[PDB]
Design a protein around this ligand. Sequence first.
Ligand SMILES: O=P(O)(O)OCCCc1c[nH]c2ccc(F)cc12
Ligand SMILES: O=P(O)(O)OCCCc1c[nH]c2ccc(F)cc12
Ligand SMILES: *Cc1c(COP(=O)(O)O)cnc(C)c1O
Ligand SMILES: *Cc1c(COP(=O)(O)O)cnc(C)c1O
Ligand code: NA
Ligand code: NA
Lengths: 260, 260, 390, 390
Amino acid sequence: ERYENLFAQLNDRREGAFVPFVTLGDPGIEQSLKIIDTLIDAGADALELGVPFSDPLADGPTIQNANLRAFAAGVTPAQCFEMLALIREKHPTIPIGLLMYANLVFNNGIDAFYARCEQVGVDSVLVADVPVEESAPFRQAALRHNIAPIFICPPNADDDLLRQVASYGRGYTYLLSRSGVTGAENHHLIEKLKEYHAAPALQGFGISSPEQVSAAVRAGAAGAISGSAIVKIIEKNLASPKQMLAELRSFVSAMKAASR
Amino acid sequence: ERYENLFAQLNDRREGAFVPFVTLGDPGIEQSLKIIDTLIDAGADALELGVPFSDPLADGPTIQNANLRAFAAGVTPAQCFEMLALIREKHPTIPIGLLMYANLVFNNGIDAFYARCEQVGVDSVLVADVPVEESAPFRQAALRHNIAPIFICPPNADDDLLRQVASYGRGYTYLLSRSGVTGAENHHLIEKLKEYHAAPALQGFGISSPEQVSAAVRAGAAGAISGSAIVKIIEKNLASPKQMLAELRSFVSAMKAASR
Amino acid sequence: TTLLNPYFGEFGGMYVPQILMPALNQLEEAFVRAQKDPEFQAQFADLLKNYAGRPTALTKCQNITAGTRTTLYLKREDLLHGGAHKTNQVLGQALLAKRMGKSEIIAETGAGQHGVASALASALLGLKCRIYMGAKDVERQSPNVFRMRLMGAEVIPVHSGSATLKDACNEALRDWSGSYETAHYMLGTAAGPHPYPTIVREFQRMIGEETKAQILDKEGRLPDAVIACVGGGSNAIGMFADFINDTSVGLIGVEPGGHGIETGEHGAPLKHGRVGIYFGMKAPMMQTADGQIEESYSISAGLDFPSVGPQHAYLNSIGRADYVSITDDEALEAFKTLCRHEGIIPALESSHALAHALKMMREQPEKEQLLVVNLSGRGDKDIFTVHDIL
Amino acid sequence: TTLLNPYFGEFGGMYVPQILMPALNQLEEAFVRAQKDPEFQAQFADLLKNYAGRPTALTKCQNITAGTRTTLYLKREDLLHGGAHKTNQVLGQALLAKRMGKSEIIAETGAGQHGVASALASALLGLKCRIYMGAKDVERQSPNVFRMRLMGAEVIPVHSGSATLKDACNEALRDWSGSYETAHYMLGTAAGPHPYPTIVREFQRMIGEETKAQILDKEGRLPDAVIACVGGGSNAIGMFADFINDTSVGLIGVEPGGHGIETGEHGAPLKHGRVGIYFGMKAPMMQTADGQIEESYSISAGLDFPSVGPQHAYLNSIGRADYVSITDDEALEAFKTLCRHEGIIPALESSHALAHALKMMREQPEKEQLLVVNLSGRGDKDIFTVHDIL
Ligand SMILES: O=P(O)(O)OCCCc1c[nH]c2ccc(F)cc12
Ligand SMILES: O=P(O)(O)OCCCc1c[nH]c2ccc(F)cc12
Ligand SMILES: *Cc1c(COP(=O)(O)O)cnc(C)c1O
Ligand SMILES: *Cc1c(COP(=O)(O)O)cnc(C)c1O
Ligand code: NA
Ligand code: NA
């Protein structure tokens, strides 16, 4: 719904979507909420939010540290859902996607996690360590609660995977620009995904420069996701909240500008 | 010769022989020579002298320490033979027996060791780690140089050994009062030895009290050898040479007195 | 789809980022063909025999059981090259790696034994070895680290998270997700995503096959029970495998109880943890009420895996195998007792298994029972540890 | 008189205080009958097989000899329970002790390995173990001491003399001269008074018998040469024994050259010492010009015996066997090379033997030769030593 709407609008304005990713609670609750409000104000079209997990095995150093900072702040999944509600209360239309690790979703029951996402206003959920082969229980629970189950299309994707990602996914398709893990300092698919009517593709991993966003949209992607590049600005300005928000505004506006 | 004479005399005076044992060079050359002169003056009938060896495996702690003190003094086998000559020059009739370990005798040639003993005036040689079974080369060399080869008669001695010790030995027969090693704080044979015409028996090991000497002679032995008991007096008076000689005189005279 | 079932009942699976599935599928396929390849088996058996020292002996304890009706045998994996059972499987995974054309090896290690085994197999077979180890463990396992380096392996400390084994497991997967093309991930236990649980078991299965033939030869009958400690589950499943269909044979797994189950400071996720999804599998594990993964605690560093192999969780659920725990103190006492009465220094890990056999014997001395304990390793490595405690 | 010849040519004998001869004669007699006793052999072989881990493997090195025409095999005594070849003989001497009705065991040890082996055999067979160790060694061998204690053995420091192995050998003989009635002296090498040189060889002889059958099986022919380090001579003679009559097989013994022969700081009495009489035997040894016995020096603590077995001095004199030396640095390099290319950590003692094989290969790379090195032990114990040096 929110993704459909966002994508319809962006298409009319002939522009791509810029989606920043940050870890909920980094460096703290109050500052995280401020960081998020600044990202939206600065031009973000949607948000990709991570819930601090103890063993983020699909994450590079930058984001591994973000989780640590979050834990150091006493941040828990329960507190995240509290933040999630406050964010939705402030911004009714921005799509909100969660980047999760399987255990946090499985913990208190799969269906119960999605029910909570729904009541909080979350739009999509990407479970990093759940491949399409093991997704049945997860996507069904997501569908039952009107949450879009997001799937990753890796570069080494064969046709069969392509078809599955296209029919199982919703909201958007996460397109991996490379193998490896998340890290800022690190087309055939796009066409096939379109052919199979996959949800709009959002490219992620390594997107840190404005020209990368332009190129992604030019390649056929509906937008780009950028995480480590954003999180790095947070860690580098820990001692000064003010400069952190200022630099965040600047980077985000420059990145969104490039989406047009 | 010297043993024959000593034993003939002692027999006429109806008394047993008291033989002290000390390590040559303990605690030093000058003091050792003084100690020896005091032992003779005090009543010793003969001397049993040890040459400092690195691995005295038939010796208990007391004498092990005597060897260490000797080495600490820079005492060598060559220096011992020098002392041996000076001692003989001063006391022409006292029998002198050496307590040796095999390597020191074998070192520069077996025959050469006995030739040196002969020219220095030594009377007998007891090689602690050479049993009668391995003594051929040693006793023959001893005989060729008029040195008496001394053999040990242990308590667990069977008849065959008895016969060998009787025919191979000369000067005196070393009679072991017990098994184990040398240490101050630790008859059928005598008769059999006499039966086989063995050289006069001298009992050794543990003899530290005057009554032990009386009992040895009473048992049929021609005398007793005492080492650790004498050496202990040396180590206990290291800091005072004067008291060392005084105490040595007293102990020795008391021990010889008991031989009558 | 896969060629083999990735699940043992409800436990198991392949919960890894999508990017790694093809690596997993390639591995399962290579394994299935190797398993049917006579040339591969001959090669594996050759190395096990002439390089590792198989078959290991089955020692009857004659002093320890005096006064009871218990006959105790010890399967001597402590006599295996490397001093532990880990050697069997790394040699097989290394041959698998070559079969796939892989030239590099990635490995995770806690106490360091898997690291050492991975390093020695790599050096022998000409593979480049990369080893991940939690910074805290690197610090406490200085000897094993030098051993790994001495064998030409690269040891990379992991300062993220708790900086222990689980964090090293994370880094290895991270590394692999980007290098699977030239490198093979040599997982250290019978856990993780399919087909590792299956592969590691099949490459450790000779322990149980040898034991069976050896006991049949010496006692003319199958044991009443075979006992093994369970850190991640490889030595245990290696021992169990060949006896699973012999229903008369009891299968007993012993998890570390640390300072005591009730203290919360243990490493017994199978019986005192909760099912979760981590390290590419659905299995019971040490985790908070929130779902955050926690460390396993034990006097023996080699039983530090915060979860357990899926086939064990499964065997337990259907009642084919029983799992118990043994505290530090009980393992210590068993360690001392074996040194003193049999002249064998056991690994503190294996001592957990021994301690339970001792308990079965002592609690019912007149019960006639034929027991086999899997002595997974030797304890030279534990000498100082047991020293200080004592 | 004795039943067996106490001499190998001019070397050997029984140069002990008269009080010990009956003990020696009793031992020779017990040995001669045990040797003919089928029940004794069955028992010995049983323990070697089911408790110690025999037969040990014969590993072909496939990386180390690349580029040359040398085929190198390693006899894996490092895989023997205890981590060294010493275990074979102490198990036999322990059975001998029981056969004589003896209930106590006396042992001397330098590096501590013989102490540990004596302790483990005693614990297993229910004998009380008394171990003499030079105070200096006790201090430098803390781990082995705890191991001995852990196994119930009494460890008595020897502060006399140099406070090293030779002094411990003295104390053991002193003790024995007074307790031979209830105790048996478990000498640690193929040296000392007859019949120890003969007994220890016969109880280590399976090393060479296994090798021969194993090489014949794998190569269809006898080796060109078998190589072994020589501290006192047991692992070496154990390897040589069965090949002595196969004149086509070279027998090579390697003594430690320490910092270099010319430096005087070595442990090669056989080729650079002088015949003397000590430790109950006539053999070459480290002694001053005065005849005082000196210590042997080497980077490897286990090659500290200041003399050598008489059968070796004899084999050398008649030219049946050749003896060479290897310096600390050469042993070190061989140690590193084996870890890195074969994944085997060798004892620094055995590395002397390996280093010579490496030299034979490297000096004449096109020479076709089939070599066997006796890997007498594993080097886990040497890890820190090689660490610091490096
Ligand atoms: O800009 P970068 O490279 O930090 O990408 C971050 C993309 C969002 C992101 C954060 N954590 C992840 C874990 C798995 C995954 F598939 C995607 C992500
Ligand atoms: O008093 P005691 O116990 O010290 O005995 C000394 C006897 C002389 C003596 C000194 N060292 C020896 C080594 C062997 C041996 F047969 C005798 C002796
Ligand atoms: C590695 C190890 C274990 C634990 O691993 P499992 O996978 O549980 O077998 C147990 N014992 C020893 C000696 C080990 O080295
Ligand atoms: C004891 C030992 C040696 C030395 O003894 P020998 O009697 O010379 O065999 C050599 N290698 C190892 C590993 C040892 O433990
Ligand atoms: Na576990
Ligand atoms: Na030597």
